[PDB]
Each structure stands twice: as structure tokens, then as C-alpha cells.
């Protein structure tokens, strides 16, 4: 089923540690996935004003 | 933020025709307009910095429910980017555009008794730059020609010689004047360091200046998501219920 942000949520029967380990890893990688506009802002702070 | 980037009389007039009155007004109480306050500017001084609040700061303030209050809110939006808190304006007025409030008789608002000298004092025209004064005079001229008080506009200009020097050279009825106008009314624009200014007006204005570069790119997608399946509010068709208190 779809979520509010447009992501797809899959509800399945699965194990406990398999769910915990896999979903935690998703959170860690997603912490470092950012929009291109935010990346440009980060780049601009590390270069001279021109 | 969009109203401040317009640098021509054509673009400013086009924006006002598209923008409804809802974005000119605000829904936040704010504080009393004129008041001597101490503000914290720790980048410069350890002591609190004295200043006076006004209606030109880009911060909402309380406004009365009258035509004078509505006019003041519209002008503040044009010259500062933020309006004022006028309680319970009504659906009929909010759906009309800013220009129609200024230049049309079908809005249901009487503006024949407006006093231009009092409005300028209430808007603190003394602490305005060249661009802001020009925008205020554009709104004054539009109201003057709408109600036929073109003479009173000239009397006000004659009493204030500095404003007469920088007055706009367009006639509201004619279109050749708008097409050939060469004024520069832009306040915000792409160039400034991320620093703090002493005055409330200067600090708030610089906040708009620093946020314009980011707003130029981020507003497109976020806006389109909001009104993907939404009916436009401007001149929305309705049963024409009533106009209360005006």
C-alpha cells in the first residue's frame, strides 16, 4: 500500500531478527541519502564566495 | 518573497493581479505596531539594542477592521513582504486580487475618504528607502485615480518635495506609460554574508535577501505539490453571500 510520501509499504510475514536487521540497515543508509538541492548547498559552503 | 523580487512596474502590477488578498493579510497576532523595545544583538553589543517597532518590519502586527487597515496591510506586503492581522475579513474580499482592491469598484470597499498624509505617517515613510517609497506611491496613485481624487495626490506630493522627486511617471488609465516605464523597484535579488544587522527592518530585509537564492530553486516542486488538485482561490465562483462590516 502507498504511504503519505509516495513510498511503497510492503506488509509480509517475516522473521523478527530478519526484520530488525534489514530495516535498521535501511535507516542507516537513508540517513545519508539527501536531495540534490541540499547537496549543492553543502558544496557551496566549502568553496569561495565567487 | 515573490513580491519583493519584481523590478519593473509591469512585473509588480502583474503580480498584484494574480495574487489574492489572502497573502496580503496574515493570521498571526504579533504585537502593538509602535513601541520602544530593547532587542538582543549579541554579534555587536553585550547590552540590549534599542529600537522602535513599526509596520514596515516583515512581521505581523495588529490592525483595525477598516479600509485604512486593509490599505495599510496591502502596502506593507508590497514594501516589506509581510502583511498584518486584520480579524475576520471575509471570504468575498479574500478571494479578490490585490489590484482589484486598489483599482476596481466591484470589490465593495469605499476608499474615497483615505488621507494619504496619515497613511504615510502610520507606515513610517521617513524610515523607507528609495524603492519602498516608489512602491507606496504606486499604490497611492492607483487609489487616487480609482476614486477620482487625483488632485489630492498632487497636493500630497507638493507638501512632500522629496517624494515628488522620485514619484512614478505612469498614469493608471493609460497603458503606454506602464509599457515604457523604466523604474527599478526590486528589493530582493540575487547578488552578502550570513551576518546580523542592527535594525529590525535591516535584519528582516537581509533575511529575505539571503533566502531568495534558496527560494529560487525550492519553491517550484513544493508549490506544485500543494495545488496539484486544488481549485484556484482567486475570483472563486460562489453564491455571493454577504460583505459584513464594510
Amino acid at each position: 500500500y502507498p504511504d503519505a510520501d509516495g513510498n511503497d509499504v510492503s506488509i509480509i510475514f517475516s522473521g523478527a531478527m530478519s526484520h530488525a536487521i534489514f530495516t535498521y540497515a535501511q535507516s542507516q543508509w537513508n540517513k545519508n541519502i539527501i536531495k540534490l538541492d541540499d547537496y549543492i548547498r553543502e558544496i557551496t559552503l566549502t568553496v569561495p564566495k565567487q | 518573497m515573490d513580491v519583493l523580487s519584481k523590478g519593473s512596474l509591469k512585473e509588480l502590477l502583474a503580480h498584484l493581479e494574480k495574487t489574492p488578498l489572502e497573502e496580503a493579510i496574515s493570521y498571526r497576532i504579533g504585537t502593538v505596531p509602535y513601541q520602544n523595545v530593547l532587542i538582543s544583538r549579541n554579534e555587536y553589543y553585550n547590552q540590549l539594542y534599542p529600537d522602535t517597532t513599526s509596520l514596515i518590519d516583515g512581521v505581523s502586527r495588529e490592525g483595525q477592521r477598516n479600509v485604512n487597515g486593509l490599505i495599510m496591510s496591502i502596502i506593507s506586503y508590497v514594501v516589506s513582504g509581510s502583511g498584518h492581522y486584520i480579524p475576520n475579513i471575509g471570504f468575498m474580499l479574500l478571494r479578490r486580487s490585490i489590484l482589484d482592491i486598489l483599482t476596481k469598484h466591484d470589490t465593495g470597499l469605499v476608499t474615497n475618504n483615505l488621507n494619504y498624509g496619515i497613511i504615510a505617517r502610520n507606515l513610517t515613510v521617513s524610515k523607507m528607502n528609495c524603492e519602498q517609497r516608489k512602491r507606496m506611491l504606486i499604490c497611492f496613485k492607483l487609489l487616487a485615480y480609482k476614486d477620482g481624487n487625483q488632485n489630492d495626490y498632487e497636493i500630497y506630493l507638493n507638501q512632500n518635495i522629496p517624494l515628488k522627486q522620485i514619484a512614478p511617471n505612469f498614469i493608471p488609465g493609460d497603458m503606454r506609460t506602464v509599457i515604457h516605464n523604466q523604474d527599478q523597484l526590486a528589493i530582493v535579488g540575487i547578488p552578502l554574508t550570513q551576518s546580523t544587522e542592527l535594525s529590525i527592518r535591516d535584519d528582516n530585509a537581509k533575511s529575505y535577501k539571503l533566502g531568495y537564492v534558496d527560494w529560487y530553486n525550492s519553491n517550484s516542486f513544493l508549490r506544485e505539490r500543494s495545488e496539484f488538485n486544488l481549485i484556484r482561490l482567486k475570483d472563486r465562483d460562489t453564491k455571493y453571500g454577504k460583505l459584513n462590516g464594510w
Binding site: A16, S18, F22, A25 | -
Partner: protein
Amino acid sequence: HALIKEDLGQWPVETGISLVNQAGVFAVQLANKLGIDKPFVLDAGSNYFT
């Protein structure tokens, strides 16, 4: 009778040797088996039937 079992494999551990050391070595193997050691985004919105 019926039951549900989560099969994550069998990972023996020696008592004398340090448990944290063995757990860390097994963690690298488990992450490789689950395919979550390298940056990834889950793409599981297409596997459905109507």
C-alpha cells in the same frame, strides 16, 4: 501440529575465545548474506499480483 521457524543459520561459538570477537566476525558474514553491507535502497514495489 504446525509451527513457523526462522532459519538464520547455525553459528557455533567457542567458550574460551571472546564472544564479542566472534560476534563481530559473524556480523560481517551475516551482512554479506543479507546483502546490506553496501549502500542500497529496497525496490520491492513491483513484486505483487492482482
